[PDB]
Protein: Copper oxidase
Amino acid sequence: ITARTAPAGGEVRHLKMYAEKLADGQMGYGFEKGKASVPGPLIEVNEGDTLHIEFTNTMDVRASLHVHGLDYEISSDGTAMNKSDVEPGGTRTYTWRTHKPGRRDDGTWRPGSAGYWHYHDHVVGTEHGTGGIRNGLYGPVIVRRKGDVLPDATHTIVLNDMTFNNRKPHTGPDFEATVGDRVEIVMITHGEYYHTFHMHGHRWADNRTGILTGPDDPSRVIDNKITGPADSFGFQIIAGEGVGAGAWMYHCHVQSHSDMGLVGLFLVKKPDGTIPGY
Amino acid sequence: ITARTAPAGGEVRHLKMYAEKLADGQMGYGFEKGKASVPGPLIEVNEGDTLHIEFTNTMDVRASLHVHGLDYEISSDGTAMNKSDVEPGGTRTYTWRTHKPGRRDDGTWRPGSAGYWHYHDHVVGTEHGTGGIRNGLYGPVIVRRKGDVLPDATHTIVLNDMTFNNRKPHTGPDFEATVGDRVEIVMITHGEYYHTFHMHGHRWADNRTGILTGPDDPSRVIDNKITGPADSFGFQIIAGEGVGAGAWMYHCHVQSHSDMGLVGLFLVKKPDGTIPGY
Amino acid sequence: ITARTAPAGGEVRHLKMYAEKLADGQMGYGFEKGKASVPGPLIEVNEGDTLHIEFTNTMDVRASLHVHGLDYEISSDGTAMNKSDVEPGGTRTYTWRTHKPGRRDDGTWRPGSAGYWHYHDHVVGTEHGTGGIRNGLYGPVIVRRKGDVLPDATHTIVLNDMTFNNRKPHTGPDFEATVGDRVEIVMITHGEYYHTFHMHGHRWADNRTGILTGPDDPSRVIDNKITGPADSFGFQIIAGEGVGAGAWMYHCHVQSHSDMGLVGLFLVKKPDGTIPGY
Ligand SMILES: [Cu+2]
Ligand SMILES: [Cu+2]
Ligand SMILES: [Cu+2]
Ligand SMILES: [Cu+2]
Ligand SMILES: [Cu+2]
Ligand SMILES: [Cu+2]
Ligand SMILES: [Cu+2]
Ligand SMILES: [Cu+2]
Ligand SMILES: [Cu+2]
Ligand SMILES: [Cu+2]
Ligand SMILES: [Cu+2]
Ligand SMILES: [Cu+2]
Ligand SMILES: [O-]
Ligand SMILES: [O-]
Ligand SMILES: [O-]
Structure:
């Protein structure tokens, strides 16, 4: 493999993170005050890394930070039950740990932390963060395994109820690439409804990475994946591979969801920057 | 393996295909005028084959042909956005390509086109073919990999909203086999609802083919699979294997869906042609 | 592997089983009269075992016993269509068989019976057991493969409509373990709604066993699994592995389902018996 690969982990990382009420009524996470985003900023670490997140709740209600898949003690649960949320104006240091796969003492195989995970609030609105998740307090986490193929860019599409990334329907989001780009998509589903993410002209493997290890990988290859609340998956694709440039749309394939406007455009450009038809 | 296996692909195939309004108000695809069917005719190719489909829209509304999983340029998208639908009375030549898996230049593994896919309309009713799919404009596509085990027969069951193959509830469809037959089922889900396809007395592997490669295949073995709009899977079973002949029913396992009449019969006969109990 | 492993099967087991109307209006299965439970008693066998179940319907309505995944002749279908239910006060002997994986005569690989399966009624209320399943006539079946890692304890959580194990919402069930225990969870979904089972601080492999074979297992590692009616999966976890002791909650992640009270506690204790925070 002559592509860029993820290195071995084991670094202790430090992060500052804020929960912010936005002008439009939404709430979002951010690395800087006044720079909150919906979805929240992407957190990407390697297996074995430890992450210390100094989380400050700038909001006037209790907020928290709860992560999937990663290792964390009960004190970083992010739940009210476990005294792990953050008072308004307060600041709390969460700790997320990751680990490499390996053989246990009993001879069994312990899985690693690698995967496409996500974080979200767990105390806003209800004791399960129904209000915070609805308002936009969610974000992706990528834990890479040593040797994982690294992409040229990573895009996050979050199916939050009847919206993509809390955007108004019929407004995308659209993103761009050039034929041959290695594009990584992180997909998170939140809310109350099930969905089916479909992508025109592209396909991926239904496994951890979206890529096949080789000729022996039995993982099914799909272009349509069913998804439910708190499901997080991701994949990589070669933009326009075998299909060329064009406005390749993606959408939920529940018929009235795509009719509602749960549609976006994966704009793959020719090397001259143009898209067939425009 | 002394069973019939799929050969290597690479042939350029040509197909004529029509979109037809049926007498009962449905719309269906067909290879011959007056011979349209719901679901549409099965298209089965090998990895590496190229398929040229001369599609004629005999209907009085705009129709199109959109396929999953297979390679196609933006001009064969089958969408109105990409000027790829067909005017009433018009004729357009779509091109679907398939490719074998292989090593990329960067050393990564490119997946093949093999799988249980499907095609459907994308412009009737709405810009996502909600009307065409509802009316019956859908059909299965099978792309085989070299060496894939070939069945004795292939049956298509499409869960379109609250119907099997757009049939009236409580009317099947039923199909037959003899104990020992290698039966292939292609399952496509369309519409607005999620379902769970269940089969009495039989089970399959939850992978691309429904079959295990061997003792090292980690794919789970199931008899109940959750499914959503535009999901397409398939499998093969030995009829009556380990269970004998009988009227083995299949149904959606959502309780009121099977109560509604989303039930069919997999009639497996003894070598004398009889079914236990009848 | 120095952990306890499942032995080779091939024993002919005999079981007595009752269908009982409970005082609160529910119906449940049991091995002894007056000792019925919801969910029903766990049945655990090895691949190759044969199970003879003398089933007695103590109820005043027709009841039956239908199993998933296991081998059974048409006479043990448990359906009214196949004359396989049990009259009120009647007694019928069902036979479930299991088989090991192996090579077929044609050279193909026949899958084994191993997996996390379940049994339920099929004639109470409707011809699909909608009434019996609702009333609590469901139970887990575990078929082990030779060499499968054996747990310290097994817990069954059944998502029946808007309840866990037909319990009142906000009432668990909760169960306990000590840090380091090998805990097995069997998850069955019944009824009309889809769900997503999520577990704090723990994760498992999305395959047959919930465990990875080793460094070559491509199965995705998850902590959130979408599930529908008659879906049955299971996994094993090391309680508190990498996260420590604490009140680790599990819940459906459909937002108002967890808000409704579809939440339980996986109480992992320190070696001194205490849970952090209490
Ligand atoms: Cu939670
Ligand atoms: Cu949707
Ligand atoms: Cu498509
Ligand atoms: Cu969550
Ligand atoms: Cu589409
Ligand atoms: Cu259904
Ligand atoms: Cu069944
Ligand atoms: Cu489609
Ligand atoms: Cu059934
Ligand atoms: Cu639920
Ligand atoms: Cu969680
Ligand atoms: Cu069932
Ligand atoms: O589509
Ligand atoms: O069933
Ligand atoms: O959560």
